[PDB]
Nucleic acid binder design. Structure first.
Length: 51
DNA sequence: GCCATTTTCGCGGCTATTTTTTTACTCCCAAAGTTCCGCTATCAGTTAGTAAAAT
Protein backbone atom coordinates (compact mmCIF):
# COMPACT_ATOMS: atom_id res chain seq x y z
CA UNK A 1 0.00 0.00 0.00
CA UNK A 2 2.74 2.47 0.94
CA UNK A 3 4.80 1.90 -2.20
CA UNK A 4 1.65 2.23 -4.32
CA UNK A 5 0.79 5.54 -2.65
CA UNK A 6 4.34 6.84 -3.13
CA UNK A 7 4.32 5.73 -6.77
CA UNK A 8 1.00 7.47 -7.45
CA UNK A 9 2.14 10.69 -5.76
CA UNK A 10 5.42 10.69 -7.69
CA UNK A 11 3.68 9.96 -10.99
CA UNK A 12 1.21 12.80 -10.40
CA UNK A 13 4.00 15.22 -9.51
CA UNK A 14 6.07 14.33 -12.56
CA UNK A 15 3.02 14.62 -14.81
CA UNK A 16 2.17 18.06 -13.43
CA UNK A 17 5.74 19.33 -13.80
CA UNK A 18 5.94 17.92 -17.33
CA UNK A 19 2.69 19.63 -18.32
CA UNK A 20 3.86 22.99 -16.98
CA UNK A 21 7.24 22.67 -18.71
CA UNK A 22 5.53 21.79 -21.99
CA UNK A 23 3.31 24.86 -21.67
CA UNK A 24 6.33 27.10 -21.15
CA UNK A 25 8.22 25.61 -24.11
CA UNK A 26 5.23 25.94 -26.44
CA UNK A 27 4.81 29.55 -25.33
CA UNK A 28 8.46 30.42 -26.07
CA UNK A 29 8.83 28.60 -29.41
CA UNK A 30 8.36 32.00 -31.07
CA UNK A 31 11.31 33.43 -29.13
CA UNK A 32 13.34 30.44 -30.31
CA UNK A 33 12.46 31.28 -33.92
CA UNK A 34 13.27 34.97 -33.45
CA UNK A 35 16.73 34.08 -32.12
CA UNK A 36 17.42 31.42 -34.76
CA UNK A 37 16.52 33.80 -37.60
CA UNK A 38 19.98 35.41 -37.25
CA UNK A 39 22.17 32.33 -37.90
CA UNK A 40 20.95 31.28 -41.33
CA UNK A 41 23.37 30.55 -44.18
CA UNK A 42 26.12 29.21 -41.90
CA UNK A 43 26.07 25.56 -42.96
CA UNK A 44 22.80 24.64 -41.23
CA UNK A 45 19.24 25.02 -42.45
CA UNK A 46 16.56 27.05 -40.72
CA UNK A 47 14.72 24.10 -39.16
CA UNK A 48 17.94 22.64 -37.74
CA UNK A 49 18.64 25.94 -35.98
CA UNK A 50 15.05 26.02 -34.73
CA UNK A 51 15.34 22.51 -33.26
C1' DG B 1 -20.36 8.49 -63.25
C1' DC B 2 -18.70 9.51 -67.51
C1' DC B 3 -16.52 13.70 -70.96
C1' DA B 4 -13.73 17.41 -70.72
C1' DT B 5 -10.18 20.51 -68.90
C1' DT B 6 -6.31 21.59 -66.05
C1' DT B 7 -2.02 20.05 -63.94
C1' DT B 8 2.32 17.68 -63.47
C1' DC B 9 6.19 14.84 -65.66
C1' DG B 10 9.69 13.92 -68.70
C1' DC B 11 12.19 14.99 -73.05
C1' DG B 12 14.87 17.90 -76.36
C1' DG B 13 22.46 14.96 -81.64
C1' DC B 14 27.69 13.21 -81.40
C1' DT B 15 32.80 13.77 -81.03
C1' DA B 16 36.89 17.27 -79.91
C1' DT B 17 39.69 21.75 -77.61
C1' DT B 18 40.31 26.33 -74.54
C1' DT B 19 39.71 26.82 -68.11
C1' DT B 20 39.27 26.47 -60.03
C1' DT B 21 36.13 30.48 -56.54
C1' DT B 22 34.39 34.91 -53.83
C1' DT B 23 28.41 37.50 -47.64
C1' DA B 24 27.00 36.06 -42.97
C1' DC B 25 31.59 34.91 -37.46
C1' DT B 26 31.09 35.70 -28.54
C1' DC B 27 33.90 34.19 -24.81
C1' DC B 28 35.71 31.68 -20.61
C1' DC B 29 36.64 27.83 -17.70
C1' DA B 30 37.28 23.44 -15.75
C1' DA B 31 37.88 18.67 -16.92
C1' DA B 32 39.54 15.04 -20.04
C1' DG B 33 42.04 12.68 -23.55
C1' DT B 34 45.98 12.89 -26.65
C1' DT B 35 50.65 14.03 -28.30
C1' DC B 36 55.77 14.99 -28.37
C1' DC B 37 60.11 14.95 -26.44
C1' DG B 38 63.31 12.39 -23.72
C1' DC B 39 65.07 8.21 -21.51
C1' DT B 40 65.41 3.11 -20.82
C1' DA B 41 66.30 -1.51 -22.22
C1' DT B 42 66.29 -5.48 -25.28
C1' DC B 43 67.14 -7.79 -29.51
C1' DA B 44 68.94 -8.32 -33.82
C1' DG B 45 72.03 -7.09 -37.23
C1' DT B 46 76.55 -5.68 -38.53
C1' DT B 47 81.48 -5.47 -38.10
C1' DA B 48 86.13 -6.17 -36.27
C1' DG B 49 89.21 -9.33 -34.46
C1' DT B 50 91.43 -13.83 -33.80
C1' DA B 51 92.14 -18.64 -34.03
C1' DA B 52 91.45 -22.80 -37.14
C1' DA B 53 92.39 -24.78 -41.26
C1' DA B 54 94.35 -25.30 -45.64
C1' DT B 55 97.61 -24.48 -49.13
Amino acid sequence: ERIKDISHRMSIGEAKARRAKKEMVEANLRLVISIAKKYTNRGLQFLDLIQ
